[PDB]
């Protein structure tokens, strides 16, 4: 799928750590970029209005 693209969290994505972009199940993200063959990287406009980006397993989301 041509980047970028949309993707929906089938499941919460939560860690430690700050590169990670968490979500909960429902979300709707844009990927702007594909890091390796596990991984995402996207964003979408949280609660407060502020985006946040970050990486996140594919395994996670469906185009």
Sequence with gaps: PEVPFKVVAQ???????????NFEKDQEIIV??????????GEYQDSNGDV????????????
């Design 11 to 21: 499941f919460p994505y939560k860690s430690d750590y700050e590169d990670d972009l």
């Design 32 to 41: 702007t970029s594909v890091e390796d063959a596990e991984w995402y990287f």
């Design 52 to 63: 946040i980006e970050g990486i996140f397993p594919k395994s996670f989301v469906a185009v």
